[PDB]
């Protein structure tokens, strides 16, 4: 089965990505990027596979995708994206590469590892490299702009973003890495500007989650050219009030990053007072609270949250608060259900490992950190942890049957690829 | 002619008084028109007298019509950071009238009432008019000079328009035109800018006393004003005393105003609030004596209404009438004087005089038939052939002519 092979070929590369590339595993940022991405996929034609959207800590702008609906976005995209529709146009562009099976159809002409080595070199700040035909790039722009429009974004954002890539391709000695995987001749641009001119004029406003995502990405995961500049923060202090709340949020982050917690708490207060129930400031409200060993206050606030049952960001934030507060069992009650509902989330497993370690449930601790190692492609290491777990439980027990069964599953993943 | 339009203007004004939420505050209306008036005298193409009205509406809007009657929404004060920005709106709106743009627009094509219903809908918080790109490209650039000869900031207009863009109401009735506002302001001159003492207190009383929705006098602004020039610090103290009186914190209100009144005992704003605090504590005698020693007592309309009201609460309706009888003949269109005069004549048991004063209130609010009814009642209580009967019946005649025009 091609779709079956593609989905597990994708899982193999995604596991290699987690284990060696610097992915941003932050709950707020990953939930936003996937919520935005899924909103595009839900308006794409002939989607035959699930989709996941990954974020790299890389200041070089690039974007690419491979089998299984897995698209990779560098954090530099938030530095170049002035509006949400520009970032959406890049994801729409990459989503269309997958639906058209461009990378899959290009490979029909040691080889599984040859492609995986290319994928991580493009994602790592340590950079072979894949390239699409300019015909392929035209289909991705043609199909991407229509997904862009049906999703309620500005179609003129795609040519506007392409032109900003061209103005740095000659006003700078460095060709941005995105232009080498996705080449941009003026024909590509003039074709894009023409299509946008022929759709409906639409002025769209970037969501409030976009500016907060842009602030957290550049502020909290700053790296190289990926900074949250004071020039941009002061510029956001003059724009629409969404950018001002985002600008306030960004300085609260940097005040927390520099351990000026009371300075950060007092900056964050007015935004939390206006929106007491949104996850973005709730997330940092606990972060500053635990920075001062006020874990009870973080717990009380999160138990009063409306959407604690539905929002994973809230669920992890409270589990972490229970851990720092000295109640690991309450953290485990949340995380046992959390890890079962999000088996691919390594944040959940790592926190469960912490909770089970604090409870001195060593077999369950080893099994929890085994899942972290399995998600990172460290299957030999995951098997070692579950072997140790299975050696601490009586034979014939279900814990032994379950630990040994999980080892069996990881061995099958292992033999499918060399 | 100007005659029909001035009379059409009076008809639309009467309709506004009856249905739109006008701010009839003496201090605020005296300031709104005093600033308009010397701003008016710096344009020369004016055919008509000018009156400026303030509407309690938290949605920002401004418009004008026949007879030099301009309408300003109270939301204008929270958008106006300085006196020139506030006059920038008025200079733009008076320039519409002097050049006769709205009259020009309706000469192209039941109509007079349809426009009045629209004028209320814009004014009332609970269909609109819209101007072409030239029309206000006229008004703004014709209005920036009218603002400069009056000694205010020419750059005050542009900073106001940009503060409108990033929030996308005034914008339905009013980048190309905006780029021209910054285009045209930079060329003329840069100007020293200093708001009047009255602008800061007027903004304090509008946002503090007539707070409604987005029209609040926030704890962020008056903390800021306490750090400004000495005019803004006195205004910040005035606003805090005003809000304490609004919250019926009477003792705190007296002690907050005490240093301002001690420094400026003849200031009309503080003298006014000192009466409200005195009457609020049933101390009418103290409020009366303070107002009799005010320097501008028989020249300033705000002080006269304040003392007239204090005489009523103090149990001296005759002395109140002696003031108000003269006030209503000097300020015929002031409904406050007519209402206070009706209260005094009711307390003196001069019934036909009370009905006559009440009638003027209803005539100003556009209910001419009711005013005719009350005067008819007054004329029936007075002897046929008396001078009173001749006046009452003459005023009925004047009101009937008004309603026969429309
Ligand atoms: Zn491409
Ligand atoms: Zn206008």
PDB file of C-alpha atoms in Angstrom, chain B residues 111-205:
ATOM      1  CA  UNK B 111     -37.801  65.015   1.740  1.00  0.00           C
ATOM      2  CA  UNK B 112     -37.274  67.440   4.630  1.00  0.00           C
ATOM      3  CA  UNK B 113     -38.649  64.911   7.119  1.00  0.00           C
ATOM      4  CA  UNK B 114     -36.648  62.060   5.607  1.00  0.00           C
ATOM      5  CA  UNK B 115     -33.437  64.032   6.157  1.00  0.00           C
ATOM      6  CA  UNK B 116     -34.469  64.904   9.713  1.00  0.00           C
ATOM      7  CA  UNK B 117     -35.120  61.263  10.574  1.00  0.00           C
ATOM      8  CA  UNK B 118     -31.647  60.489   9.225  1.00  0.00           C
ATOM      9  CA  UNK B 119     -30.168  63.352  11.267  1.00  0.00           C
ATOM     10  CA  UNK B 120     -31.679  61.874  14.429  1.00  0.00           C
ATOM     11  CA  UNK B 121     -30.504  58.351  13.560  1.00  0.00           C
ATOM     12  CA  UNK B 122     -26.923  59.611  13.310  1.00  0.00           C
ATOM     13  CA  UNK B 123     -27.246  61.682  16.488  1.00  0.00           C
ATOM     14  CA  UNK B 124     -29.260  59.191  18.546  1.00  0.00           C
ATOM     15  CA  UNK B 125     -27.235  56.293  20.024  1.00  0.00           C
ATOM     16  CA  UNK B 126     -30.235  53.966  19.497  1.00  0.00           C
ATOM     17  CA  UNK B 127     -29.762  55.057   7.288  1.00  0.00           C
ATOM     18  CA  UNK B 128     -27.005  57.676   7.229  1.00  0.00           C
ATOM     19  CA  UNK B 129     -25.580  60.458   5.069  1.00  0.00           C
ATOM     20  CA  UNK B 130     -22.244  60.256   3.277  1.00  0.00           C
ATOM     21  CA  UNK B 131     -20.008  62.753   1.488  1.00  0.00           C
ATOM     22  CA  UNK B 132     -18.032  62.382  -1.727  1.00  0.00           C
ATOM     23  CA  UNK B 133     -14.245  62.293  -1.928  1.00  0.00           C
ATOM     24  CA  UNK B 134     -14.023  65.862  -3.235  1.00  0.00           C
ATOM     25  CA  UNK B 135     -16.578  67.239  -0.757  1.00  0.00           C
ATOM     26  CA  UNK B 136     -14.484  66.542   2.344  1.00  0.00           C
ATOM     27  CA  UNK B 137     -11.250  67.041   0.432  1.00  0.00           C
ATOM     28  CA  UNK B 138     -12.717  70.532   0.224  1.00  0.00           C
ATOM     29  CA  UNK B 139     -13.734  70.622   3.882  1.00  0.00           C
ATOM     30  CA  UNK B 140     -10.474  69.430   5.484  1.00  0.00           C
ATOM     31  CA  UNK B 141      -8.104  71.620   3.486  1.00  0.00           C
ATOM     32  CA  UNK B 142     -10.528  74.549   3.591  1.00  0.00           C
ATOM     33  CA  UNK B 143     -10.770  73.819   7.337  1.00  0.00           C
ATOM     34  CA  UNK B 144      -7.072  73.645   8.185  1.00  0.00           C
ATOM     35  CA  UNK B 145      -6.629  77.325   7.427  1.00  0.00           C
ATOM     36  CA  UNK B 146      -9.741  78.229   9.459  1.00  0.00           C
ATOM     37  CA  UNK B 147      -7.970  76.400  12.304  1.00  0.00           C
ATOM     38  CA  UNK B 148      -4.645  78.221  11.789  1.00  0.00           C
ATOM     39  CA  UNK B 149      -5.992  81.806  11.927  1.00  0.00           C
ATOM     40  CA  UNK B 150      -7.599  80.840  15.259  1.00  0.00           C
ATOM     41  CA  UNK B 151      -4.193  79.967  16.711  1.00  0.00           C
ATOM     42  CA  UNK B 152      -4.331  76.163  17.051  1.00  0.00           C
ATOM     43  CA  UNK B 153      -2.230  73.222  15.818  1.00  0.00           C
ATOM     44  CA  UNK B 154      -2.436  72.582  12.064  1.00  0.00           C
ATOM     45  CA  UNK B 155      -0.883  69.138  12.679  1.00  0.00           C
ATOM     46  CA  UNK B 156      -3.717  68.386  15.126  1.00  0.00           C
ATOM     47  CA  UNK B 157      -6.007  67.296  12.290  1.00  0.00           C
ATOM     48  CA  UNK B 158      -3.624  64.684  10.733  1.00  0.00           C
ATOM     49  CA  UNK B 159      -2.820  62.899  13.990  1.00  0.00           C
ATOM     50  CA  UNK B 160      -6.570  62.574  14.544  1.00  0.00           C
ATOM     51  CA  UNK B 161      -7.226  60.907  11.171  1.00  0.00           C
ATOM     52  CA  UNK B 162      -4.490  58.284  11.605  1.00  0.00           C
ATOM     53  CA  UNK B 163      -5.956  57.513  15.040  1.00  0.00           C
ATOM     54  CA  UNK B 164      -9.104  56.562  13.093  1.00  0.00           C
ATOM     55  CA  UNK B 165      -7.556  54.190  10.551  1.00  0.00           C
ATOM     56  CA  UNK B 166      -6.034  51.446  12.720  1.00  0.00           C
ATOM     57  CA  UNK B 167      -9.449  50.734  14.315  1.00  0.00           C
ATOM     58  CA  UNK B 168     -10.994  49.424  11.083  1.00  0.00           C
ATOM     59  CA  UNK B 169     -19.672  56.080  13.422  1.00  0.00           C
ATOM     60  CA  UNK B 170     -17.810  59.082  11.982  1.00  0.00           C
ATOM     61  CA  UNK B 171     -16.146  56.930   9.313  1.00  0.00           C
ATOM     62  CA  UNK B 172     -19.412  56.237   7.459  1.00  0.00           C
ATOM     63  CA  UNK B 173     -20.311  59.920   7.095  1.00  0.00           C
ATOM     64  CA  UNK B 174     -16.598  60.784   6.802  1.00  0.00           C
ATOM     65  CA  UNK B 175      -5.758  56.671   2.423  1.00  0.00           C
ATOM     66  CA  UNK B 176      -5.922  59.196  -0.413  1.00  0.00           C
ATOM     67  CA  UNK B 177      -7.821  61.826   1.581  1.00  0.00           C
ATOM     68  CA  UNK B 178      -5.823  61.044   4.736  1.00  0.00           C
ATOM     69  CA  UNK B 179      -2.498  61.168   2.910  1.00  0.00           C
ATOM     70  CA  UNK B 180      -3.617  64.626   1.740  1.00  0.00           C
ATOM     71  CA  UNK B 181      -4.378  65.722   5.313  1.00  0.00           C
ATOM     72  CA  UNK B 182      -0.777  64.939   6.272  1.00  0.00           C
ATOM     73  CA  UNK B 183       0.232  66.135   2.805  1.00  0.00           C
ATOM     74  CA  UNK B 184      -1.358  69.557   3.444  1.00  0.00           C
ATOM     75  CA  UNK B 185      -0.640  70.101   7.156  1.00  0.00           C
ATOM     76  CA  UNK B 186       3.141  69.788   6.936  1.00  0.00           C
ATOM     77  CA  UNK B 187       3.417  72.519   4.293  1.00  0.00           C
ATOM     78  CA  UNK B 188       1.891  75.446   6.158  1.00  0.00           C
ATOM     79  CA  UNK B 189       3.747  75.898   9.467  1.00  0.00           C
ATOM     80  CA  UNK B 190       4.619  74.275  12.813  1.00  0.00           C
ATOM     81  CA  UNK B 191       2.839  75.829  15.796  1.00  0.00           C
ATOM     82  CA  UNK B 192       3.280  76.263  19.513  1.00  0.00           C
ATOM     83  CA  UNK B 193       0.355  74.435  21.131  1.00  0.00           C
ATOM     84  CA  UNK B 194      -1.222  75.125  24.536  1.00  0.00           C
ATOM     85  CA  UNK B 195      -4.730  73.998  25.424  1.00  0.00           C
ATOM     86  CA  UNK B 196      -6.880  76.513  27.262  1.00  0.00           C
ATOM     87  CA  UNK B 197      -7.520  75.972  30.953  1.00  0.00           C
ATOM     88  CA  UNK B 198     -11.176  75.484  30.019  1.00  0.00           C
ATOM     89  CA  UNK B 199     -10.465  72.658  27.560  1.00  0.00           C
ATOM     90  CA  UNK B 200      -8.949  70.443  30.263  1.00  0.00           C
ATOM     91  CA  UNK B 201     -11.811  71.012  32.720  1.00  0.00           C
ATOM     92  CA  UNK B 202     -14.431  70.707  29.965  1.00  0.00           C
ATOM     93  CA  UNK B 203     -12.954  67.339  29.006  1.00  0.00           C
ATOM     94  CA  UNK B 204     -13.039  66.399  32.696  1.00  0.00           C
ATOM     95  CA  UNK B 205     -16.718  67.283  33.145  1.00  0.00           C
TER      96      UNK B 205
END
